Amino acid sequence: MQKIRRDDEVIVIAGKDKGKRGKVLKVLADDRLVVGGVNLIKRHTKPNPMLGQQGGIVEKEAPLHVSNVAIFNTETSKADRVGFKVEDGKKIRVFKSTQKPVQ
Amino acid sequence: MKRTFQPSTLKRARVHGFRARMATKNGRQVLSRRRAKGRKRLTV
Amino acid sequence: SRVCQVTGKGPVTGNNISHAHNKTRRRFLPNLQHHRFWVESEKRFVRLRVSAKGMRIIDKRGIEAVLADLRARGEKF
Amino acid sequence: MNQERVFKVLLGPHISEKATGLADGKSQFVFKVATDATKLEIKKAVESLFSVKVQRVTTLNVKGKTKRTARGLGKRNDWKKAYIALQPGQDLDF
C-alpha cells in the first residue's frame, strides 16, 4: 500500500521548497508526485495560429520525487514516517512516533 | 547487351519457391537452416 | 534391399589389401537367390529371397516353422 | 444467409467528390464493404436494411498505399468498394 496517497497532507523535505506544506494532487508513476503550491514553473508555448490557437505563458506545478515529502502529523506539527497497522479486517496507516491513525 | 538476370515470376516460384524446397529433404534443410539464423524472408 | 528374409543378413563393408598393403573400401554381399518352397499346409508355393545359408535353416527347421517366425516379426514376403 | 452476416457485410458509405456526382446524376451509391463480400450478399443486405430495390451491383478491389518512414516501408489495408445502382427514383438515406 502507498504511504503517500492522493489528496493527502504533506510537507516538503529536501529541495528548494524545503519546509512548505501542501496537498498531493496527482500521483504519477515512477515515484513522482504533484503537490499543490510547490515547485512552480513558467512554460512558454508558441500560440501558433495553425491548428486553432494556443496559450502564452502559464504557471503550473512540476512533479517532485516521492521521497522528498512526508506525512504531516497535525498534532506535533512535524514530518513523520508511517507504517501499516494490524487489521481488524483491513490495513490502516498509522504514525511511527505516536502509533495513531492518519486520515 | 543481354545481361544474366532476365526476370520471370513463374520460373522464380518453380525453382526457389516454398513448395519447391519442401519437396526434397535437401531443400527442407535450407528452410530449417534459415529458421535458425532468424531470417525474415526464408523463401524467394 | 539385398537382405536375407529369413536370417536378416545384409551387406557389410571391409577392405581390399594389395601386396603393397594399399587399402580400398569394398562390400561383402550375402549370397541370396529366389526360390519357391512347397508349403504343405497351404497347398501352394511361396517364393522368398533367401540366402543359401537361409535354405540350410529351412531344410533343418522346416518351412512351416520358419514362416511362423517371419509372420511374428511383421515380414511381408 | 444468416442474420449475423447481414450486419457484417457493409462497412460504411464512401465519401468523395466522384461519389457525390454519381448519387445525383445516375442514382448510384458508393459503399465500403467487407473484403469477402460477394455481389449477391451486398444485394440482399442493402434491401434488407435500407428497404430499397437495388437493380445492379458492381465491385472492385483497392490496393493499400505504401508509405516510407525511417524505420522501413509500411503499407495500409487493402479494402473493397461497391457501386450500388438503385431504381430510377429513390434515396438511400440512413
Binding site: - | - | - | 450486419f7 460504411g12 465519401i15 436494411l49
Partner: protein, 61 residues
C-alpha cells in the same frame, strides 16, 4: 452488461439480445463513416457486449 444478469434469460431471448447489439454496432459504424459521431467510446463498448453474450451462450449446453 454484466454476465450475472445474462444468465437470468434463456437461449430464445438471449439470441434476440445478440441481434439487438448487431443493429447497434452497425448503426454506430454508419455514423462513424459520415463523421457525425460524438460518443466515440461506444464503438469499443458495444464490441465487448457481443463477446460477453456469446460467452454465456456457450455455457448453457
Amino acid at each position: 452488461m454484466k454476465a450475472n444478469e445474462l444468465r437470468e434469460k434463456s437461449v430464445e431471448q438471449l439470441n434476440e439480445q445478440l441481434l439487438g447489439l448487431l443493429r447497434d454496432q452497425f448503426n454506430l459504424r454508419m455514423q462513424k463513416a459520415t463523421g457525425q459521431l460524438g460518443q466515440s467510446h461506444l464503438l469499443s463498448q458495444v464490441k465487448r457486449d457481443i463477446a460477453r453474450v456469446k460467452t454465456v451462450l456457450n455455457q448453457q449446453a
